[PDB]
Every structure is written in C-alpha cells, then in structure tokens.
RNA sequence: GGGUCUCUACUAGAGAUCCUCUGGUAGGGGGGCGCUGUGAUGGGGUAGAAGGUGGGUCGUGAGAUCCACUGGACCCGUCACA
RNA sequence: CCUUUCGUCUUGAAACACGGGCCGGGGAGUUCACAUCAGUGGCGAGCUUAAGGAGAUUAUCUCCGAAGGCAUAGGGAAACCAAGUGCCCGCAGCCUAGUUUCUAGGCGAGGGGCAGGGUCUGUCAGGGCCUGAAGCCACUGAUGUGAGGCUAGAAACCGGGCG
RNA sequence: AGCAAACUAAGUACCGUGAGGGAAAGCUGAAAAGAACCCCGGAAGGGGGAGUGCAAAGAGCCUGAAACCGGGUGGUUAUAC
RNA sequence: CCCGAACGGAAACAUCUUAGUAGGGGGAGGAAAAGAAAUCAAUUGAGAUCCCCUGAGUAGGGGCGACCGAAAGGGGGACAGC
RNA sequence: AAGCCUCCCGGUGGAUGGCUCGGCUCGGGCACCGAAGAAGGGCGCGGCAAGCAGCGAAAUGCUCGGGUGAGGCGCAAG
C-alpha cells in the first residue's frame, strides 16, 4: 500500500510524442507515437535537447503495474452476470461499469454491486 | 422458390402492378364479421367501417373515405389534423393497423368473391 | 552460362552444356524383384511371371525352401536359393 | 500441438530416472526429425525377454525371432501384430511409468 | 456405460458405448477438419477484369510542369493508375484464388471420432454453452422416437428428458448482427441447439423437428464435424437413438 | 538469455528462485496493437447505438477504457479464420 | 540552462543538394503453377486419390473410384550386368561395486574411422557413381523461376482505319 | 467504392473536320402537419415575433470533423527572437 | 476457313522465340467442326468421332543457346450407324 | 495598438458514421432474327407536354376471349 507513490509521484512521466508534432497540425492532432527512422533524424541519433526515444527501461515496477490509482485491480463489467463471478472478494477489485448500459439496468446493477460490498469507480 | 435478398423483396412492393395492389390493403375482420362470413381477412374499400388497434389514436372507429393503393394507407372520417391556416387534412393509417368492423355489401362481385373463398354454405 | 555465371557452371553445372550418347528405341523393360523383397506376394512353388516380374536379384536371402519360376536370375540368387534348399526354374514364360 | 503429447512430456520430466528424462528430451525434437525404429533392428540388437524403450514410433519392416517387451509412443498396426504374434508385449509411455516392474526394471535398452 | 430412456424420460436399459467414445478430445484435430469442410462451401468471388482500364489515357511526358507528374492522364485528367480516382485496383480479387483446404480421408475420420467423444463428456457439453438438467450425457432414446410426426409433440419429448432449457437459450435470438452482413441477407445470428442423430433419413422425425429453433436432424451415416463441432468448438448437445449407435459402431 | 522447480483438457498462460548481459544502418530472427467480414460463445449492450468535441485514468509503446455535452438506430468482449 | 529544417541519394552528402503552402479522403510485395527448406498433423514399406459414379436434408455432407505419381536398386552411351556385412573407437542410457561420490568396470541403439559388396573404365595398384531399410500426403510460412508480378515513368516499332 | 453510368437525359451533357475521347451528381420527416397571421423590406424557403413537430443546422433540409474567417473567455504585449 | 506482324526475350542480335498470336477478308448455328480405318501395335491383339484426368516437360526439335514439344496406352463421360 | 497562444460560440465546408429499388462474381436454364422488309436511326403523337419511357396520321393507345374486382387518366403532387 505505501509503495504506490515512491515510484510515481517524484518521477513525472514523459509523453513520447512523434517527431515534428508541433510544426504540422496533421501530425500534432494524432497525439500518438511513431518510431523515428530517417537517416539524419535527431531523435533516432539521441542528440542533446531532443525528447527521449521509447525504451524498455522505462517500464513500471511490476508490483504496482496496471493498478487503479486507488490501489485496486480494475474490472470492466458489462452485465449483472459478471458480478456473480467475483474472485476472492471485494478486497482487491474496483468495478468499472460499462458506458453503454442504459439507465434502467444501471439502477439494478449498482444495487447488486453495493450489497456485495464492491467498490465502484463511475458510480 | 423466391429470392430471400432484402433488395429483391423491396423492389416488388415498390413497383407492384395495379391488379396486385390489393395485397397492400389487406386487413383483419372483426370477430363478429367472421362468424357470418367465414373468412379471416379481406381487402379494404371505401365505405367500410374501420377501428384502430395501434397508434396514438387507438380505439378510434369511423368510416373509410379515401384509399392510397400504391402505399397501402386509408383515411378515416373525423380523424384529421389542421394545417397552419386551419383547413383540416387527413391522417393516414396503414391497413395492417386496423380491424374491419362492417362491410359495404353492394358490389355483387365482391360478395361472390367472398363466397368463392369458402364462406360456409351461403 | 559462359559469360558471367560460368563460375557456377564449372562447379555446379556439369552436363549443363552439350550432348552425350543416344537412347535405344527398343530397350527391353525388365521388372526386377530381390530376395529380400520376395518374402511377400503380397502377404511350394512361386510363379513370378504371373505378377509381372522378370528377373530375380540377389537381395538378402529367403527363410524357407521354395521353387521359383522366373525368366532370368542373378548368379548370387541362384546359389543362395540352393543353400536354403530351394531350386530355380528358368522359364521365360509360364 | 497435441494435448496428450504435451501432458506426457510434463510428467516424464518429473520422473527421477535418467531414462525417462532422456525420453522427454527426445520427444521435443522437431516433428520432421522425430525418432522411429523398425522391427528388424529390434531383433538384431536384443535378446529374449528384453525391454526396449523407443522414443518414437515402431514400424513393421523385418521379422522378430524372440519375445520382447517394447515401450513406445505409438505402434504401426502391422507392427503391433507382428510383436504380439511372436509372444511379445506392448505398452505406452503413459503406462510404463506406473508399472511396478518398470518402477525398478533391469535389462532395459534404449533404441532408435 | 450409459442408460437408455423412453419417451417419458424413464430409464429402462443400460448399454455400453463403443470404444470410439473414450478417445481423447483433440481440439487441434477438430479445427483441422472443420476448417476444411467449411471452405468447401465458399463461392468464387472476383472483380471486373477490365474495371478501371476502359480508357486510353497516357503519360504527357516532361517539361510540361503543369502535367504535374509522369502519370497517365487522358487529355488533362487522371486515369488508370492505382493511386488515382476512378483508376484500377493494384491487386484485385480474382476467381483463380485457391479456396478449399484438403485433408486426408483417414485424418478426417479420426477427427470425426474425436468429436463424437466430446459429446459423451459432460464437461465439454457444459463448457460449450448448453443448458440441460439431465444427469446423463449423451441421451440415448428408444427407436420409437423415429415416428414422431408433429413439431408440437417433439417439444413434449424434449421437456421430459430435460433439454428445453437449450431451446429457451436459442429462442433468445441474438437479434440483428453488426455490420454490412445484414445488408446482404445475413440479418440475424442464432445460437445452436440440440442435435438429433437418427438411424435413416426419410424417417418422419427428420421433417417434424426441422422447424424447432436451433435443432438439426442428421442420419447416423452422414454426420460429420460441421454437425458435431459447429464453429470449431466441440461438445454440442446431441441426442441419439438406440439403432443409430449400431450404425456408428460400424465406422 | 540460461540453469533449477510448481500448477493448468496447454498451438498457451500463471508463478518461485539463482547466474550473466543492455549503442546501432543494411539485414536475419522473437512477441504484440489496430481495421473490415465469416463460424461459434460463459457472451452480451441499445431508443440512452455508431460517429463528433473537450477532458480523466491505465500501458515503455502501438493502443484501451471512462466522464460531460452533441447525436437519433444500430454495436461490441472472448475463441478460431480470412 | 539545453537545443540548426523534415524525407532522401551519398564517403560525407546536407545545408547556397533535390521533393516539400494548409486540411480531408484515396494510394504501392499480390494471385496461380512447379521446385526446395521449415513448424505441426495423419498413415507408414508404403502413401495418396484425379477425372468421375451413387446417395442425400442437393455447390456443404456420405460411400466408392489407385488410373497415374512419388518411394522401394543402382551402374552404363548402349548391348548388358545387378548389392545391403565385419572390425575398431565410442556419446546417451542400462547393469555391477563403491554411492567413498562415480570415463571404476562391462554392455553400448543413434555417431565416427577403416574395410567389404554392385556397376562402368584400365592389362594389376588404381579412378567415377551407388550400397549400413523411411517415405508419402495435408495446412501454413519463406525463397527461386515463369506470367503485369511492389507502384509510377520513355523515346520508339507494328496492324487496321481517319483526315 | 461497385460497371464509365444507384440520381430530371449515361456512352447522356460536353470536346474534336473525323476516326474517336468522355464527365458531375444519392439521404427533411412516421405523416407536408412544407411555417397561418402581424411589423420591416423593391424583392428574396429574406429579417423579427409567432405556430407545426419526439426533434427545426426549415427547402443551401440525416449526422456535421479539419483547414480557413468573425466575435468573446483566461494569460500577455511597442528595449528587443 | 483463308491471309498474316512487331514490341518484347535471348542480358547485344540476324536463324529462333513471341505466334499462326494481334489483326484483316469470307461463311454459319443454337451449338459448330469431326466422325464409321488405304488406323494403331507386335506374335497376332484392339476396333468411328469428340471432351476430361493422365502418359509428360517423356520421345523429339534447337546459334543443341534462350527455349519449343507429341502420339499410342491406362481411367472416365457419352456410347448408335448408314 | 498592430498583435500572440488556448478554449467557447457562429460562419464556411462536406470528412466520419449509418442507410441503399445500383453494381460484381459464380451456379442453373434457354437460345437465332430478316424481302410477309430485320437490327439500327430520323421525324411525329398528351387540353395545357420540354425530357425519358410508351406508341405511329386508328399515334400516352382500337377489337375479341380469359383473370381480377373498385377505382383510373406513367415518371409527376397543378
């Protein structure tokens, strides 16, 4: 539990955006990463003042990787039958209700999860 | 032995010839009419009395005053809507949303067609 | 070839260029069976002319004394059949 | 890719005899190079009432003189009836693990 | 070892299935045979062989500049090339493409055996999706089931033996599918239901049960992987007659 | 990457432990993301869908998912295939 | 405080080298045949059906159809002739003794080296090829070749017509 | 995209003396109920107030992105990239 | 049924191939054409024509280069004869 | 003030999404017309009729049988 901000809070993350994302709007509006390959490219050569390349040394600690910022394990629930298959219990999961479920089924879906003691993100 | 393609089914109902357009106007008879006529459905003509089973005016009963045989809709007297100036216009309801309450038995060729369709004895 | 791929030809291309010999138009077609393979038809006299076999070859050896009728046989086959106790009859056709 | 070949390899490795660990290693060869043996070679290099362990398939070329017990992954159907007709026995690699004499067998030969 | 049932679901016998039904279930082998039979029913598609080429457009050359590129253009405007509007496809589909996947006949018959065993394993039947309350799998019925002629009294049999829960599962039709398939006659997508294997075709039950949602009827000497393992997933709920087992025992 | 072990109807997953290695073009090799359709499915969702605009969170990343508004009828998760 | 304009040919180029005003949509290793390798599956001294025939719930499915092909014997231009076994090392593994801890000793499938055997040639030694019993079929991928063949691009040459 | 051609007339319009070459372009709504009447304007499916409809991107009609332009919010600007 | 190219490939090119193709002229039909041995093959056998799977990239042609290329026989579909 | 960056609202624009009485490929049928004037073309015909389709000075249709049963005067609502 106390090992969640020792790796995250001090190390503000890089964005890893494609080259020339700020000169052309056709490249800047995608907001995604693409590997540099030009023979003279400067992010490929890793020159000074040029926004790091993507590397495997940037991964996160395996014991906190992929967790909800509340410290639990997120589960995306699309039906009421997904609640009955709760593993272990309410101690280690946070429920993510699907966005497309209509308002009438949501009322019954939230009631079912509340009595089980589960924690809901988008309640 | 006809095609199951949705486009081939729709091209038939939008280009149906004059002698076959009676199929678009078929409607169910009331329970009392089928006691004394021995058939379950019939096509609608002007002068029949008709009652609605579906729509925002369900239960409304009147008489047929117009037909649109190309689309399969009927106009009932007293079921109107007024325009901007105030002159009323008819509300068209499909023939599959109505049930026939009484017939106009005055053609003598409609009547023996009903008998040919196995009315019981006469 | 002979211009720039002739480095391949002199090493991997023997017989690529030229003529050698002739074909006989009247070569006799012979269907040969060995002793090692003969132990199956196809699973005491054996008449091999019936199954379309012409010559009997040395092969390995048999396991039982048999009488074989073939058009032709090899010298080793003739001597190895005698050792088991068999006998070879050279009948060109049954 | 076979479900039963994978579960057989995982249980051979758990065995505590170097004979069975070598069989599991040999069964992991590429399929194009998997081992096999014919009847004629088992006959040449064995004595009566031996135990032959083949890490592949036993095929039916040649003849068999003496009775032997042969343990293999699979048998050709002509090859299976050659062995039984001469008084031998056949087992699968699955059953050979559990057999009580095969717990502490003696005079065992590994062939291919 | 399974029991035989009468039309009311009562047990009246006890038989032993052939040793085919004890073969291990091999999902890799069943997928080989299913994908081969599936591709035999595909039709050849292709494009117009001349689409995009019905023109005499040609390159203008160089030094024009305004003929901006050495592309082919017919008195000014673009034509014929794969990157232009109204041009030809670079690699259009053709009827020459090979569609079918062959399997050996001996490999096929083993794949059918492996699928017949998956219908005798209650774990594979429950893991495929089917709902049933019968304690015995597979269901073996007496041969009087051949003579049922009305689709109403087939449903009475399925209720007694405990299979109608699979009919309700099917009858919740998965409505309208997603995509351009519905434009082409493929409007719905329905679950698969129980399978019935009978001694011979031409029996009355072949026609009477042909309308029940999800079910299929096939003779014991015609059945293959596409019936036992639809989609490539073994373990379809199956009903056999007493004399369909004997016909299967001879293969 | 390699050695040594555990569990699982396993073309793969989930783990424990010990040693060592970490620039890269041409190029060779291993794993994954995304798009459209087909056979299945514990499977589901919808007049409250798809799409659009702005913003949260997860992942080195390709990407995934949620929130508010817009919109008015269709669309997705998993397994396999093309 | 640190940081020259992207892609590219090129030793470098790279910029006073070329293509580059903005945004949206489209846009380039694909198909078949043969061959050879590979990952897996079926059968195995054999493997496999093609065209097709019969049935059926009728382009799926089931049964039949080995014709032919590849492999099983090779050498020689041809007439013609025609093998497959015995010595030594020895990995894994097994046994025995000590488990002191183990090439200590035996047995050693697969593997290596010397020979042997078939055939052509030489007047002997020699010289060439073969012989120590595993292949066929299927799916997928890679590469070669042939077809437009990753996409675009010539100046030209020919046939028949129109001025 | 699919045939060059899903539409007020496709080998149609249009180009060439001729042989010949060869386009573009789909979508209101369930129903026209397609906006009566009043003020402005020369007129205008023009402006404003109304009214119809579940809902007016209401005739230039489904949804309605970006480039581009105008108005506004929050920072900031005439000693210096 | 007659007349009849070049581009390209051979890493040039002329025999060759491309190809009796593209094209030109004449004549039909719902099909055309072929069709009842002055045939094949080999110890005295088969038995009109046509189409499919083969034989087979075999025999064989060729600046013996690039390349070109059968028939008989076997399995079938229909199977007449005047 | 010329302005500069960001978001909101509007304009202009017509992408994205959804739709489809149009195409495309296979199977299966069926298969000649013409001097008794063909195929192809040109001009006409509607109350107001320009185009397409239909028709030919008997010209948006004439006669006789059969089917059908209440509306009809094509695309196209005056």
Swiss-Prot record, chain A:
InterPro entries: Ribosomal_eL32, Ribosomal_eL32_arc, Ribosomal_eL32_CS, Ribosomal_eL32_sf. Keywords: Ribonucleoprotein, Ribosomal protein. GO terms for cellular component: cytosolic large ribosomal subunit. CDD domains: Ribosomal_L32_L32e. Disulfide bonds: none annotated. GO terms for biological process: translation. It comes from the Archaea. One of its GO terms (molecular function) is structural constituent of ribosome. Belongs to the eukaryotic ribosomal protein eL32 family. This is Large ribosomal subunit protein eL32. It comes from Sulfolobus acidocaldarius (strain ATCC 33909 / DSM 639 / JCM 8929 / NBRC 15157 / NCIMB 11770). The gene is rpl32e.
Curated annotation (Swiss-Prot), chain C:
The keyword rRNA-binding applies. GO terms for biological process: translation. GO terms for molecular function: rRNA binding; structural constituent of ribosome. GO terms for cellular component: cytosolic large ribosomal subunit. Keywords: Ribonucleoprotein, Ribosomal protein, RNA-binding, rRNA-binding. Belongs to the universal ribosomal protein uL15 family. Binds to the 23S rRNA. Part of the 50S ribosomal subunit. This is Large ribosomal subunit protein uL15. It comes from Sulfolobus acidocaldarius (strain ATCC 33909 / DSM 639 / JCM 8929 / NBRC 15157 / NCIMB 11770). The gene is rpl15. The chain holds residues 39 to 144 of 144 of the full protein.
UniProtKB/Swiss-Prot annotation, chain D:
Signal peptide: none annotated. Pfam families: Ribosomal_L27A. Coiled coil: none annotated. GO terms for biological process: translation. Keywords: Ribonucleoprotein, Ribosomal protein. One of its GO terms (cellular component) is ribosome. It comes from the Archaea. GO terms for molecular function: structural constituent of ribosome. Belongs to the eukaryotic ribosomal protein eL18 family. This is Large ribosomal subunit protein eL18. It comes from Sulfolobus acidocaldarius (strain ATCC 33909 / DSM 639 / JCM 8929 / NBRC 15157 / NCIMB 11770). The gene is rpl18e.
Curated annotation (Swiss-Prot), chain E:
One of its GO terms (cellular component) is ribosome. Pfam families: Ribosomal_L4 (PF00573). The keyword Phosphoprotein does not apply. It comes from the Archaea. The keyword rRNA-binding applies. InterPro entries: Ribosomal_uL4, Ribosomal_uL4_dom_sf, Ribosomal_uL4_euk/arch, Ribosomall_uL4-arc. Keywords: Ribonucleoprotein, Ribosomal protein, RNA-binding, rRNA-binding. One of its GO terms (biological process) is translation. GO terms for molecular function: rRNA binding; structural constituent of ribosome. One of the primary rRNA binding proteins, this protein initially binds near the 5'-end of the 23S rRNA. It is important during the early stages of 50S assembly. It makes multiple contacts with different domains of the 23S rRNA in the assembled 50S subunit and ribosome. Forms part of the polypeptide exit tunnel. PANTHER family: 60S RIBOSOMAL PROTEIN L4. Belongs to the universal ribosomal protein uL4 family. Part of the 50S ribosomal subunit. This is Large ribosomal subunit protein uL4. It comes from Sulfolobus acidocaldarius (strain ATCC 33909 / DSM 639 / JCM 8929 / NBRC 15157 / NCIMB 11770).
